[PDB]
Enzyme design. Structure first.
Site, mmCIF file in Angstrom:
data_model
loop_
_atom_site.group_PDB
_atom_site.id
_atom_site.type_symbol
_atom_site.label_atom_id
_atom_site.label_comp_id
_atom_site.label_asym_id
_atom_site.label_seq_id
_atom_site.Cartn_x
_atom_site.Cartn_y
_atom_site.Cartn_z
ATOM 1 N N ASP A 1 12.883 47.599 -41.712
ATOM 2 C CA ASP A 1 13.176 47.269 -40.299
ATOM 3 C C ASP A 1 14.313 45.916 -41.230
ATOM 4 O OD1 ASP A 1 11.424 48.378 -38.444
ATOM 5 O OD2 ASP A 1 10.207 47.525 -38.333
ATOM 6 N N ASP B 1 4.541 47.604 -36.794
ATOM 7 C CA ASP B 1 3.825 48.216 -38.061
ATOM 8 C C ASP B 1 3.010 48.475 -38.966
ATOM 9 O OD1 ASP B 1 7.340 48.036 -37.690
ATOM 10 O OD2 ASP B 1 6.887 50.355 -38.362
ATOM 11 N N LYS C 1 18.774 51.547 -38.979
ATOM 12 C CA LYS C 1 17.344 51.658 -37.550
ATOM 13 C C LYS C 1 17.472 50.780 -36.632
ATOM 14 N N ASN D 1 12.854 42.623 -35.997
ATOM 15 C CA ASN D 1 11.353 43.003 -36.987
ATOM 16 C C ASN D 1 10.738 42.390 -35.862
ATOM 17 O OD1 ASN D 1 9.806 44.554 -38.488
ATOM 18 N ND2 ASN D 1 9.782 42.958 -39.839
ATOM 19 N N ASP E 1 5.230 41.062 -36.499
ATOM 20 C CA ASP E 1 5.630 41.040 -37.725
ATOM 21 C C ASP E 1 5.809 40.243 -38.252
ATOM 22 O OD1 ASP E 1 4.641 43.697 -37.475
ATOM 23 O OD2 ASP E 1 6.047 45.084 -38.218
ATOM 24 N N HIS F 1 15.212 40.395 -5.734
ATOM 25 C CA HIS F 1 15.702 41.184 -6.603
ATOM 26 C C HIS F 1 17.104 42.028 -6.159
ATOM 27 C CE1 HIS F 1 11.436 41.254 -7.613
ATOM 28 N NE2 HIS F 1 11.348 39.763 -7.809
ATOM 29 N N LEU G 1 16.885 41.525 -12.234
ATOM 30 C CA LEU G 1 17.534 42.360 -14.036
ATOM 31 C C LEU G 1 17.782 43.616 -14.394
ATOM 32 C CD1 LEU G 1 18.552 41.576 -16.781
ATOM 33 C CD2 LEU G 1 15.990 41.581 -17.904
ATOM 34 N N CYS H 1 10.309 49.888 -7.928
ATOM 35 C CA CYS H 1 9.469 48.674 -8.302
ATOM 36 C C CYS H 1 8.689 49.094 -9.096
ATOM 37 C CB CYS H 1 9.444 47.778 -6.620
ATOM 38 S SG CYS H 1 10.824 47.584 -5.706
ATOM 39 N N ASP I 1 17.352 45.028 -7.529
ATOM 40 C CA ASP I 1 17.641 46.002 -7.624
ATOM 41 C C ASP I 1 17.139 47.016 -5.408
ATOM 42 O OD1 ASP I 1 15.135 45.220 -7.715
ATOM 43 O OD2 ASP I 1 14.256 46.882 -8.903
ATOM 44 N N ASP J 1 9.976 40.723 -22.531
ATOM 45 C CA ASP J 1 8.760 40.576 -21.405
ATOM 46 C C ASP J 1 9.120 39.360 -20.287
ATOM 47 O OD1 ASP J 1 6.064 40.021 -20.130
ATOM 48 O OD2 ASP J 1 5.743 37.407 -21.075
ATOM 49 N N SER J 2 9.101 39.133 -18.856
ATOM 50 C CA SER J 2 9.281 38.584 -18.110
ATOM 51 C C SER J 2 8.390 37.398 -18.233
ATOM 52 C CB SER J 2 9.226 39.395 -16.442
ATOM 53 O OG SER J 2 9.723 38.121 -15.328
ATOM 54 N N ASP K 1 9.354 44.978 -13.375
ATOM 55 C CA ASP K 1 9.045 43.556 -12.795
ATOM 56 C C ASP K 1 8.134 42.198 -14.311
ATOM 57 O OD1 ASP K 1 10.303 43.067 -10.023
ATOM 58 O OD2 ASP K 1 8.130 42.491 -9.037
HETATM 59 C C1 LIG Z 1 11.698 46.512 -6.040
HETATM 60 C C2 LIG Z 1 10.475 44.709 -6.613
HETATM 61 N N1 LIG Z 1 10.120 44.830 -7.591
HETATM 62 N N2 LIG Z 1 9.513 44.421 -5.835
HETATM 63 C C3 LIG Z 1 8.529 43.462 -5.981
HETATM 64 C C4 LIG Z 1 7.488 43.575 -5.482
HETATM 65 C C5 LIG Z 1 7.092 42.257 -4.891
HETATM 66 C C6 LIG Z 1 5.880 41.612 -5.001
HETATM 67 N N3 LIG Z 1 5.417 40.627 -3.415
HETATM 68 C C7 LIG Z 1 3.968 40.422 -3.211
HETATM 69 O O1 LIG Z 1 3.292 41.737 -3.951
HETATM 70 C C8 LIG Z 1 3.644 40.649 -1.768
HETATM 71 C C9 LIG Z 1 2.939 41.362 -1.639
HETATM 72 C C10 LIG Z 1 1.765 41.208 0.051
HETATM 73 C C11 LIG Z 1 1.895 39.791 0.439
HETATM 74 C C12 LIG Z 1 2.599 39.001 -0.941
HETATM 75 C C13 LIG Z 1 3.175 39.166 -1.602
HETATM 76 C C14 LIG Z 1 6.200 40.512 -5.658
HETATM 77 N N4 LIG Z 1 5.957 38.871 -5.629
HETATM 78 O O2 LIG Z 1 7.355 40.607 -6.534
HETATM 79 CA CA LIG Z 2 14.743 45.702 -14.411
HETATM 80 CA CA LIG Z 3 8.225 45.693 -38.617
HETATM 81 CA CA LIG Z 4 5.187 38.172 -19.106
HETATM 82 CA CA LIG Z 5 5.603 41.147 -42.034
HETATM 83 CA CA LIG Z 6 9.559 49.688 -37.981
#
Ligand SMILES: *CC(=N)NCCC[C@H](NC(=O)c1ccccc1)C(N)=O
Ligand SMILES: [Ca+2]
Ligand SMILES: [Ca+2]
Ligand SMILES: [Ca+2]
Ligand SMILES: [Ca+2]
Ligand SMILES: [Ca+2]
Ligand SMILES: *CC(=N)NCCC[C@H](NC(=O)c1ccccc1)C(N)=O
Ligand SMILES: [Ca+2]
Ligand SMILES: [Ca+2]
Ligand SMILES: [Ca+2]
Ligand SMILES: [Ca+2]
Ligand SMILES: [Ca+2]
Ligand SMILES: [Cl-]
Ligand SMILES: [Cl-]
Ligand SMILES: [Cl-]
Ligand SMILES: [Cl-]
Ligand SMILES: [Cl-]
Ligand SMILES: [Cl-]
Ligand SMILES: [Cl-]
Ligand SMILES: [Cl-]
Lengths: 640, 640
Positions: B170, B148, B345, B144, B156, B446, B390, B622, B448, B352-353, B333
């Protein structure tokens, strides 16, 4: 199903790849083949196995015997099962051919330096996983909780050195074979290592001089040492000795991994090999096993109890260890004598109770000999049920599952107990799944006060004996029906404060006593059903022993000496002399005990313990501990 | 195989035992039978089932139809399958008879008060254990993690009240039936409870007014509330709603137990019933599933990339969520869009990273709608690989095992990585066993960047695409063999700082670039073999995509726009425009991409992203995230 490597070659310059013996290497090329390639041949130095195979099917075929039509869906596998004597002494050559010109279009040469690196200890297969069952594999590591070195007053796990000549018997060997050309190691590193978590759970010693010098067993992996560089001091083989530092617990599953890695620093690894040890758990011995050593105290007024224990344990061949003063008697409450089993040296281990104050010094001082490990659990916060409460059942079958080492039995209450640390230890041993019982109704509250297992060659090999106030009800009523109601219970006994002599008529016609014993039997019946469920026993194996219970509060003590809670040594059992109603010069309770036990081949000898014990809420089993011969069934093929 | 109770009766006074519906009760006596007992009869009130059975065999037989020869090895079982309407409205009577006198020797009367108590939620059996597989059972509890209730800016799970009308969807229902005589509850207590550990992991709400009042859902079990007394406000049935508070983690196996207990305080329990919930894990969606919503940023110089993403996602029917500024672009990312499944449900959940700084506010602000859970992991200590690293594979079969939800893919190094907390979360979900890969060689690093799965109706339903410098080697060499070596790569592109236009001859004849790409391909080949082992794929499913790599340090960035790391939406994939060598007015890299992908039914549309991305080390994947339709395969019958 082995390690797979892909080493690509180039038509421009040869490559100098290093491979590991037994490992397969796929051979491909950077870029494309010559423009008009139609066929190809492949050749290898003696000792280099080359196979051709389609990428779809997995049938292999020798590749250096014909000219193959070119096909991008084919792949060549190179394997060297034997190490090289010198760098790049073997090679593979791939020639590309066309029907147009008679000479090869191009060559692709790959020189090979083969090294045979393997870490193995005792592979009981994947070699990186531990699996249970008779078809299982994996190495066993002990904890080495004894004192083999007489110079130390402390445990053998504490030293970072090895200053004993036979302590090495408690450790586990681990051989690292590193065959190959020596000059290769001028360019490559050999690193043994382990995770810091596993590093805090075991220690590893390298050897620098064989079998003679204690300082030669150099500590290489320990609490802070997580990695080490093996210098190959002996050549193509290094011996290591690993000793465990802890038992399986709540946070420790019991597995430790040791890795070896070959690095290319002139670092990039190109091969890693692993070995997984399992820390052998602590196993308890139930009363059905043959005894080895009987333990008993000698207190300021223990005169004939020790003599009776002596003259009654001499029939089963026991060592009869005696304590001079016990600083006071309860030798069954301070320690539990189990063992830890290994394929080389299975050693008995004492488990010290957190119930301290009287015998708190006995285990760590005069019980851990050469082959006698020591383990103990003390809580940070207090124990009130302790190791009288801890027993073990014979091998059973219940819930479909099979328990070939029995199950652990501890007491407590349902809606709310033994300390949580001891519970976590017992549950983490994983080999005798405990069964928590109802014992909170008793005064001291120990499982062995109402339950005892006895060996009997019939039914299941054993009989479970439970105290039952109803059995005493039946016995006293059937004796009343004869006219012996005026027979007295506590007649023949040394009376100092003159415990009042009650008769059968007085007991049977005492409403409070009878109702309290009915409540006691209801508790014991709850425990009886729980035992029948969790052990898979029937009434053929359950025998009720007559026993009444006193009380001065809402909790229960024994009325007359408790017949259960006896010392069971194979064919001979020492039972507390109940001092029951004498009807024909012989105690009728003793007659019932004989009628219940002696048909099972056992011989019942009753000990006068009214003055030493049973007035401080204890019986012979409360004053006698015993270690037993370990199970024949080995714990690793247990499939929990 | 049910609960067993032993209730003893006395020939002196009747007993007033209370039994639970469906539970068996063994009936015996305190003490012995009359002196001349030879036979016995047993009788029961209508609605009281009495069976006789020997203690050896387990065949039951009705006992109230004849006069049985007395036998101590027989036992009588009493069962009441229906609750009583009034206290002691039913009874059992045991009469003992002899052939000598015609009248009964003695009677034994046991009055019974039957109560039907049961706690059940959704028993998918033992009802106290959770087992995996299609033949498994157990209740599922969600976490949950959504919003909502519009009144709250917070999650929640945080409120102890329920101030939403549809948040209850939920939660999980749990019904407690407590049928029986009302006066019984004047003497007995009804207690719902749970362990404090489980209490810190979930909350329970009782109901005091049906379906209308938010204040009627009274919180009864929570962080500090471990037990509660159910007042039976509705009669013979109480409804509770439980909501989980945490996901399965390193220290939480994922099971929570809720118990109900009947106590006899005028306390001693006589019946306890349990219900075990499993917290549903977090499941990731691979690119093979149909998409639902495409996410993309809009930055200070993102002009036509958003338009291309829009006009290319409109073919798969996606929602096209757009961010106004992103506080800067890397929408792939910061978040990973999975889901949590329940038999009532199944809701999508964002993860969140811990890579925060640019989109750190987007998930907790504008992504958790009504049905959108939120989960995040932040370490106490730092993340450098995060959620580009990931990904998730399609359903596979490997090591004998079957992975019907695929496996998780994260990167790292062998001899030393993503933070340990994220690893522990992913491994504790237990439903997609992760595979740690080698990604440390790349600049950002990464997964990917070199690996992408694509749906294709052939072989295994999908194709794994890997970046391969050797594929570009082969393509450029085969084009050189025609004479197009003077074709330029970065010819058609808006050049501001004038990225130097390299030709095929310059690339193929650049020794440093070629050797660096050979090393890159060796890394990718290691990952390729690890993927083939851990996913059970063959070369029929693996396609190599031509891709070269730049470098300004010892780590690798893309030379031209990375063709892998594309946006895969079912039948349509958005690929970064490589700006390769124009040979006949069309980019030859695009021609190779089409020749590799379009035979699988897919349609390749290339997006100009040289100025927005690929100069800050990123491609379309990306800058585009996507959530997908959950798997049809349900996670509970997974047998891990
Ligand atoms: C596919 C993907 N998720 N790529 C990540 C993008 C790379 C990014 N690098 C920058 O933002 C950067 C640009 C120029 C100078 C320094 C850093 C990152 N740090 O993830
Ligand atoms: Ca991913
Ligand atoms: Ca809820
Ligand atoms: Ca975050
Ligand atoms: Ca609640
Ligand atoms: Ca719900
Ligand atoms: C079988 C067994 N282990 N019995 C334990 C002995 C009971 C003992 N109680 C006392 O020492 C005591 C005697 C008199 C007054 C107060 C305590 C114990 N506490 O375990
Ligand atoms: Ca030592
Ligand atoms: Ca030792
Ligand atoms: Ca102690
Ligand atoms: Ca030893
Ligand atoms: Ca014991
Ligand atoms: Cl190579
Ligand atoms: Cl545990
Ligand atoms: Cl009985
Ligand atoms: Cl005497
Ligand atoms: Cl009763
Ligand atoms: Cl974990
Ligand atoms: Cl290739
Ligand atoms: Cl353009």
């Amino acid at each position: 199903m082995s390690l797979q490597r892909i080493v690509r070659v180039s038509l421009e310059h040869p490559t100098s790849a290093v491979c590991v013996a037994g490992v397969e290497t796929l051979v491909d090329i950077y870029g494309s083949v010559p423009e008009g390639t139609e066929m190809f041949e492949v050749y290898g130095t003696p000792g280099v196995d080359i196979y051709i195979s389609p990428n779809m099917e997995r049938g292999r075929e020798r590749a250096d015997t014909r000219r193959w039509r070119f096909d991008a869906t084919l792949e060549i596998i190179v394997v060297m099962n034997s190490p090289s004597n010198d760098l790049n002494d073997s090679h593979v050559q791939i020639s590309y051919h066309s029907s147009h010109e008679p000479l090869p279009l191009a060559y692709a040469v790959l020189y090979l330096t083969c090294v045979d690196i393997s870490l193995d200890c005792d592979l009981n297969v994947d070699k990186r996983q531990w699996v249970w069952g008779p078809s299982g594999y994996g190495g066993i590591l002990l904890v080495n909780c004894d004192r083999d070195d007489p110079s130390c007053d402390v445990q053998d796990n504490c030293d970072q050195h090895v200053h004993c000549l036979q302590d090495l018997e408690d450790m586990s060997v681990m051989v690292l074979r590193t065959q190959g050309p020596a000059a290769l190691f001028d360019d490559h590193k050999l690193v043994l290592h382990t995770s810091s978590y596993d590093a805090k759970r075991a220690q590893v010693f390298h050897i620098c001089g064989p079998e003679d010098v204690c300082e030669a067993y150099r500590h290489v992996l320990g609490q802070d040492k997580v990695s080490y560089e093996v210098p190959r001091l002996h050549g193509d083989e290094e011996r290591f000795f690993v000793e465990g530092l802890s038992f399986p617990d709540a946070g420790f599953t019991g597995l430790i991994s040791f890795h070896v890695t070959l690095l290319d620093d002139s670092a990039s690894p190109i091969f890693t090999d692993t070995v997984v040890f399992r820390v052998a758990p602590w196993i308890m011995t139930p009363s059905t096993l043959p005894p080895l050593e009987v333990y008993v105290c000698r207190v300021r007024n223990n005169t004939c109890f020790v003599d009776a224990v002596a003259e009654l344990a001499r029939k089963a061949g026991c060592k009869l260890t005696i304590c001079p003063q016990a600083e006071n008697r309860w030798i069954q409450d301070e320690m539990e004598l189990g063992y830890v089993q290994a394929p080389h040296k299975t050693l008995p281990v004492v488990f010290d109770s957190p119930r301290n104050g009287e015998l708190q010094d006995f285990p760590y001082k005069r019980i851990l000999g050469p082959d006698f490990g020591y383990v103990t659990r003390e809580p940070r916060d207090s124990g009130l049920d302790s190791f009288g409460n801890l027993e073990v059942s014979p091998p059973v079958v219940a819930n479909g599952k099979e328990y070939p080492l029995g199950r652990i039995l501890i007491g407590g209450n349902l809606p709310g107990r033994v300390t949580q640390v001891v519970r976590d230890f017992l549950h983490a041993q994983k080999v005798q799944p405990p069964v928590e019982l109802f014992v909170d109704w008793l005064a001291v509250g120990h499982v062995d006060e109402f339950l005892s297992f006895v060996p009997a060659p019939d039914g299941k090999g054993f009989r479970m004996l439970l105290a039952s106030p109803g059995a005493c009800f039946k016995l006293f009523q059937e004796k009343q029906k004869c006219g012996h109601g005026r027979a007295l219970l506590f007649q023949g006994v040394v009376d100092d404060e003159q415990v009042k002599t009650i008769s059968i008529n007085q007991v049977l016609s005492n409403k409070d006593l009878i109702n309290y014993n009915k409540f006691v039997q209801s508790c014991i019946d709850w425990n009886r059903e729980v035992l029948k469920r969790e052990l898979g026993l029937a009434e053929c194996d359950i025998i009720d022993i007559p026993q009444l219970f006193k009380t001065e509060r809402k909790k229960a003590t024994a009325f007359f000496p408790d017949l259960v809670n006896m010392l069971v040594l194979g064919k001979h059992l020492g039972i507390p002399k109940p001092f029951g109603p004498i009807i024909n010069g012989c105690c009728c309770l003793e007659e019932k005990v004989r009628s219940l036990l002696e048909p099972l081949g056992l011989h019942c000898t009753f000990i006068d313990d009214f003055t030493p014990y049973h007035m401080l809420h204890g019986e012979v089993h409360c004053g006698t501990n015993v270690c037993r011969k370990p199970f024949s069934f080995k714990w690793w093929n247990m499939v929990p």
